[PDB]
Amino acid sequence: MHTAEFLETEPTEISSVLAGGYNHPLLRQWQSERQLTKNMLIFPLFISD
Amino acid sequence: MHTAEFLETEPTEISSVLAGGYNHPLLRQWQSERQLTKNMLIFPLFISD
């Protein structure tokens, strides 16, 4: 009967390991080129006659 | 007697005009590649025996 197959693999390469860079909630902020501040937003205003 | 000399010049070139990019306090934040947030700081701690 169908049994789970598991191929054999070589040792892990360090170049394959990116995960240590995003594992904590904080690392998710750390990983952004720039964060959202309030002085970045521009609110459109429609002024009537 | 010594009088203030003023050479004559040609019209201003637009490529020389950068000043409209930093004149307001807000434009000074606008001009930064990235702003300082609190989750960016890392405080060193020296723990004793």
Chain B environment of A34 (Cβ under 8 Å): 33-35
Determine contact, residues B39/A29, Cβ cutoff 8 Å: yes
H-helix or E-strand containing B29? Answer: helix B27-30
Q: Which amino acid is at A18?
A: L
Cα B9 from Cα B6, distance rounded (Å): 9
Cβ atoms of B31 and B21 within 8 Å: the answer is yes
Picking from A35, A42, A44, A32, the residue whose alpha carbon sits closest to that of residue B27 is A42
- A19 vs A48: CA distance, rounded Å: 53
- Solved by what technique? X-ray
CA distance B35 to A32: 12
Cβ contact B14:B21 at 8 Å: no
- Option in A26, A29, A34 nearest B34 (CB): A34
- Which amino acid appears at position B25 of this protein? P
Q: Nearest-CA distance from B34 to chain A in Å?
A: 6
Q: Determine whether the interchain pair B37/A39 forms a contact, defined as Cβ–Cβ distance below 8 Å.
A: no
Cα of A10 vs its chain's centroid, Å: 27
This PDB structure is determined at a resolution in Å of 2.3
Burial (CB count <10 Å: 0-12, 13-18, 19+), residue A39 = exposed
Q: From A22, A20, A42, A17, select the one nearest A32 (Cα to Cα).
A: A22
**DSSP 8-state class, residue A40:** G
